[PDB]
């Protein structure tokens, strides 16, 4: 009775969204950018190799000074690197070695990480004692922590395998907003440049746009054939890209509520673990299970270059805020800085 | 050479961090990492009780060999997105309850979970230590309910020795890479205090086989 009426209404509303999206797709991105020229071949060299992790590296995150980065490996370590000199600034022992994500707070004051312990730990990098200590243990998720990103010294957004995301008040250690709506594990987060919005990808092949303060899902973006492992915003905040197990990256527009472009090749059959944009948004970089990172022309879906040199799966990409360098991390326990 | 006074001190700090990281690496490289799997309500707690919210770790030593057992229970999330984290563990310890043969059938769920991990692409070179728990309850139950409840093809007596051996074999038959990994099977009960000895000898065998491969003798 009521259940059949409600489910029938949901399907009619799905039809209305699809028809509204078909109505907006008056042209493809490839038709608009057809004659914008070709970036050509982007050939990047390894400028730094950062040696020191011994286990698989699962995450890294650049600081806002474009010089420091944090990397997380299942040695039980976070290492804060001086990417210009390769010097290790801090080595932080973890209480749980099964770390899957880390984040470098925009201020440089805090670094976060966590993983299979379901806890996002906040470390204080700038203490009077001189060592790095845990300031908070953000417990409350019921599944592994897949991605965390800072908003401020007192705000962090997490996503976990319990299919939710949460906004945490770090000082009190509480969840102030819980973001529900995914049906599978949430794998990746990316914050909007203005950190009023964020997007997440999950193991239901959809990405969702979340309103940080309202707690609602504003948009759901479908199109992938398999789980989404990585997500990143386009630099102007009006678009984002995903990478999934189906070996395709996809660019989604927030305002047209529509998929713009797919990035794929017949010779790429393995999954994608990490995506990032260059400073102009013109290049879309993705790390693959085949140990390479591909550089896509974000406007043409051409392969602009290949960053080859890792001996195992690429686990994480990160581009500096000034665009000077690309960092890649891999299961071979090395980081590489490219330019 | 061209470094400032502070740059040299920063490099010295980095080198000391490298020293500490290598010492922790050498210590970790000598520890046995055991991944503990099993079906719900299986005798995992009986094993941990003898060996001693996400991952629950149990640390113990036996004959000067250190172990870390990683219980992934209550991590109720898609295995495909974290089970790869345990690639490289020395061995997997898997718990199956014999008393579930008469209870999808719980015994078939155990075989399906066993096959799912046993032939997983992440663990092709990782051996399994398979504990058949509650052998005493099983000995009593099998005398009243035949094993053909979960193995209709079973041909044999409704007694402990024949039915327990059949169940062991049925799990060993799930190994699709017999030339790459061994399965070490042990029958246990809540009062069996040799469980740690079973792990120690099985892990020692694994370490010797791994080093034979690594030394090139393969």
């Amino acid at each position, epitope marked *: 009775s009521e259940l059949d009426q409600l489910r029938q209404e949901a399907e009619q509303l799905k039809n209305q969204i699809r028809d509204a999206r078909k109505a907006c797709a008056d042209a493809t991105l490839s038709q608009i950018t057809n004659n914008i020229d070709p970036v050509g071949r982007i050939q990047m060299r390894t400028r730094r190799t950062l040696r020191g992790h011994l286990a698989k590296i699962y995450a890294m995150h650049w600081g806002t000074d474009s010089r420091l980065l944090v990397s997380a490996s299942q040695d039980g370590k976070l290492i804060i690197w001086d990417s210009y000199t390769t*010097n290790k600034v801090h080595a932080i022992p973890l209480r749980s070695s099964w770390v899957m994500t880390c984040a470098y707070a925009p201020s440089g004051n805090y670094v976060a990480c966590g993983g299979l312990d379901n806890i996002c730990s906040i470390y204080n990098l700038k203490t009077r004692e001189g060592n790095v200590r845990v300031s908070r243990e953000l417990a409350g998720h019921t599944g592994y922590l897949s991605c965390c990103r800072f908003l401020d010294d007192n705000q962090i957004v997490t996503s976990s395998g319990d299919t939710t995301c949460a906004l945490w008040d770090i000082e009190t250690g509480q969840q102030t907003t819980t973001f529900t709506g995914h049906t599978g594990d949430v794998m990746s987060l990316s914050l909007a440049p203005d950190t009023r919005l964020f997007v997440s990808g999950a193991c239901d092949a959809s990405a969702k746009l979340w309103d940080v303060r309202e707690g609602m899902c504003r948009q759901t973006f479908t199109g992938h054939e398999s789980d989404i492992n990585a997500i990143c915003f386009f630099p102007n905040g009006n678009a984002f890209a995903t990478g999934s197990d189906d070996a395709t990256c996809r660019l989604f527009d927030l305002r047209a509520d529509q998929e713009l472009m797919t990035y794929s090749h017949d010779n790429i059959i393995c999954g994608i673990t990490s995506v990032s944009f260059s400073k102009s948004g013109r290049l879309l970089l993705a790390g693959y299970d085949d140990f390479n990172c591909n550089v896509w022309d974000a406007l043409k879906a051409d392969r602009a270059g290949v960053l080859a040199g890792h001996d195992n799966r690429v686990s994480c990409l990160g581009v500096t805020d000034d665009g000077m360098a690309v960092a890649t991390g891999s299961w071979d326990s090395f980081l590489k800085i490219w330019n | 050479c061209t470094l*400032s006074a502070e740059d040299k*001190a920063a490099v010295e700090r980095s080198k000391m961090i490298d020293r500490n990281l290598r010492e922790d690496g050498e210590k970790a490289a000598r520890e046995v990492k055991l991944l503990l799997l099993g079906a719900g309500e299986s005798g995992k707690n009986t094993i941990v009780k003898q060996m001693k919210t996400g991952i629950v770790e149990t640390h113990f030593t036996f004959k000067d060999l250190h172990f870390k057992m990683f219980d992934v229970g209550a991590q109720r999330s898609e295995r495909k997105k974290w089970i790869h984290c345990f690639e490289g563990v020395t061995a997997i310890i898997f718990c199956v309850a014999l008393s579930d043969y008469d209870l999808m059938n719980r015994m078939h769920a155990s075989m399906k979970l066993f096959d799912s991990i046993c032939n997983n692409k992440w663990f092709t070179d990782t051996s399994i230590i398979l504990f058949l728990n509650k052998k005493d309850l099983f000995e009593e139950k099998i005398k009243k309910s035949p094993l053909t409840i979960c193995y209709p093809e079973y041909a044999g007596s409704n007694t402990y020795e024949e039915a327990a051996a059949y169940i062991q074999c049925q799990f060993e038959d799930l190994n699709k890479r017999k030339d790459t990994k061994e399965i070490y099977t042990h029958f246990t009960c809540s009062t069996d205090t040799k469980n740690v000895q079973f792990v120690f000898d099985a892990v020692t065998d694994v370490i010797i086989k791994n080093n034979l491969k690594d030394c090139g003798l393969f």
Partner: single-chain antibody
Amino acid sequence: VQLVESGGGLVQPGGSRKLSCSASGFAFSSFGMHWVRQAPEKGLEWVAYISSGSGTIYYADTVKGRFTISRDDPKNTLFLQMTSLRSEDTAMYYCVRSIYYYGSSPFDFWGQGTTLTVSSDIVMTQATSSVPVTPGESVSISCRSSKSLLHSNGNTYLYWFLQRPGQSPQLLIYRMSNLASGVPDRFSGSGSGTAFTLTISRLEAEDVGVYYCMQHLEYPLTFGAGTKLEL
């Protein structure tokens, strides 16, 4: 965070004495330690450095072969073993912590000091020894270096310290422009690499004391004579 020096007192010329510095409240083993001494009517003189892990040790040319600096991390204690003491060694000796990494603030905490009584350097010039000041007004204190302190890495290695009438020196600014943690925002610094200014936008009575410049580009570390504010 405390550093408590002990072992001072009167020594006869040519004798020996060991000073101790008991560290508490911070990760002593992770810091490098310096000894800086101040003669009864003079400014700061750098004495010796021992790095974290005791890998690197430096001495000032004035104490080479006579002073030995050593570290005991298990007891969180720094030692200075002095032999053949001279009358010129009369000074209060301050135990100073210093941690080095990208973005660190070395020389940020000084101990209280213990009084010892005996019966191609970079020269830091502070031409003005005293400035009369009024609370509520700004004041500028200048320093010049005999050598450029701007390194090719982009950092300019000058430090500002304030020593109040009854206190050990406090770090104000590190690397020319970076304000030390806990120091009021009224302090700022800038410079060319050879000429530097400390700006105090509004002077308070709590800011009265002697301001020192230090260079940290090369060892030995050197201090300026120090500019006193008379309030």
